[PDB]
């Protein structure tokens, strides 16, 4: 059972044979213009009015070109019946509005963490052992034609943020899951030296994107730019991304949302100018498994 493959000859003066000797395939040797070869990695658009449940919204990227979907029967690990709340949980929830000033270094949120106290979605999340959902994130920021500024919105799978102490991986659960308030990036790294009552919080540096990588490369993640001269809003459609078909929503945050001011806010000649940014997130294709008594995580 010999495999006769062809070689690619370079310097000329053409087939090579390979035979597998082991039953386990892990023992085998390795076999080896503007158009984007990886069209799915260049933030493909949905190519209006988005209605989910009883919520309606009137610049849309699909992360990795993959729309949210339910678990295939071929890839279902759990065996118990899945709860699908449907319109009850799959609807747009509006988080607390943040304020963009000339001095803002950026904001961040975690999903599903930011929606843990959002109507029936939070109830289903805390009542079940396993949960899964994609998202539609709508960032809203409007300003006059005389305002200038640009925001970069990034959806990062496994958005791990650096700590603030010499102790590695020391950020406690409460500070890593702030909820809908989220957190803010910082312009510099400040080390927490309070060995008695350590803050045990993140210290996400903006130009390091909070994880030791240059912010300029954050555009490799699914992203959208809100340039105030052009558009008001940004829509990101995030499919469920994980190494598992379904996981624990309380333990693990599948996505992170980062908003960084790429161009600082400015207006006329008023040094005092602030415009709100409003996030509206709708979970999509929710499904839960493992119903039992409700989880009540520790707070503060």
């Amino acid at each position: 059972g010999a495999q006769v493959s062809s070689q690619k000859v370079g310097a000329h003066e053409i087939n090579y044979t390979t035979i597998n000797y082991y039953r386990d395939s892990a023992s085998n040797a390795a076999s080896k213009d503007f158009a984007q070869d990886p069209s799915k990695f260049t933030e493909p658009v949905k190519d209006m009015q988005l209605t989910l449940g009883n919520s309606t919204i009137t610049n849309s990227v699909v992360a990795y070109g993959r729309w949210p979907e339910y678990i295939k029967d071929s890839e279902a690990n759990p065996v118990d019946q899945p709860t699908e709340p449907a319109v009850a949980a799959c609807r747009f929830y509006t988080l607390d509005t943040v304020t963009w000033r000339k001095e803002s270094r950026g904001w961040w949120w975690k999903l599903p963490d930011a929606l843990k106290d959002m109507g029936l979605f939070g109830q289903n999340m805390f009542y079940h052992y396993l949960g899964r959902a994609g998202y539609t994130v709508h960032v809203q920021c409007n300003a006059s034609k005389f305002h200038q500024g640009a925001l970069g919105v990034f959806a990062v799978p496994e958005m791990c943020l650096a700590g603030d102490s010499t102790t590695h991986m020391f950020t406690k659960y409460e500070n890593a899951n702030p909820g809908e308030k989220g957190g803010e990036f910082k312009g510099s790294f400040t080390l927490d030296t309070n060995a008695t009552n350590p803050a045990r919080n993140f210290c996400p540096v903006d130009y390091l994107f909070g994880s030791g990588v240059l912010a300029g490369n954050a555009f490799v993640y699914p992203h959208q730019i809100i340039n105030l001269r052009t558009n008001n809003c940004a829509t990101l459609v995030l499919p469920y991304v994980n190494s598992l078909s379904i996981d624990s929503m309380t333990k693990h945050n599948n996505w992170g949302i980062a908003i960084l001011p790429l161009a600082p806010l400015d207006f006329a000649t008023e040094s005092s100018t602030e415009i709100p940014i409003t996030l509206t997130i709708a979970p999509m294709c929710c499904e839960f498994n493992g119903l039992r008594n409700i989880t009540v995580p520790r707070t503060q």
Binding site: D73, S74, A76, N77
Partner: protein
């Protein structure tokens, strides 16, 4: 509905025993025979009961039938710094089936091995290896034998007719005799041959509950570790 594509390939009895388990550490010496503290040849009664791990795995079942792959890992060292050095050693491992003459000296006639299978290993070479078929006189190996080899008859004295409980010639496979073939260097050398045993082409019958307390001898006796279980509250998760 879920598509359940998970196989039990690694839990087959073949995969369960598809490993080389160490059953023997045989110690031999290369030294002047005038020395009395040095053992120039070693005899090991072939068995899997000198160690516990493979024994416990095998005793999950009452009867077994398999071929056996034996691997020999040989290590050696100087026992002294002075008295010079040594040249590469050659080891003879002679299988003595029950009945064949047993060497009494490291260099007697028995090492001619005209009929006994013998394995000559050169130090520094890859570990030696041989295969053996199923060689039981019964139709399967008996991991347990609830009986005696002798039946004491009425009339004969208490000394006669006595045999150990559970001992039979079903497990009499002979021994291994090990020696260094080289003549002694002016310095004493000590070697250890580790024997690794792998059952292959395995079949087993009559599963048993595994050993729960420390093994005590070749039988099923127990003496010391008779409280294997820890304390845990009835209503404590």
């Amino acid at each position: 509905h879920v598509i359940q594509k998970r196989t039990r390939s690694e839990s087959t009895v073949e995969s369960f025993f598809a490993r080389g388990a160490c059953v023997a550490i045989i110690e031999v010496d290369n030294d002047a025979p005038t020395k009395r503290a040095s053992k120039l040849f070693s005899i090991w009664k072939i068995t899997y009961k000198d160690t516990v791990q493979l024994r416990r795995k095998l005793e999950f079942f009452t009867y077994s039938r398999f071929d056996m792959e034996l691997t020999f890992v040989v290590t050696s060292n100087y026992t002294d710094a002075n008295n010079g050095h040594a040249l590469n050693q050659v080891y003879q491992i002679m299988y003595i089936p029950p009945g064949a003459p047993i060497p009494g000296k490291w260099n007697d006639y028995t090492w001619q091995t005209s009929s006994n299978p013998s394995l000559f290993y050169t130090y520094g070479a890859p570990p030696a290896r041989i295969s053996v078929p199923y060689v039981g006189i019964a139709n399967a190996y008996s991991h347990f034998y609830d009986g005696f080899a002798k039946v004491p008859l009425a009339g004969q004295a208490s000394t006669e007719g006595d045999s150990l409980y559970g001992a039979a010639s079903l497990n009499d496979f002979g021994s291994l005799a090990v020696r260094v073939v080289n003549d002694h260097n002016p310095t004493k050398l000590t070697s250890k041959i580790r024997v690794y045993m792998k059952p292959k082409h395995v079949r087993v019958w009559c599963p048993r509950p595994p050993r729960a307390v420390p093994y005590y001898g070749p039988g099923v006796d127990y003496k010391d570790g008779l409280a294997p279980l820890p304390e845990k509250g009835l209503t404590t998760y």
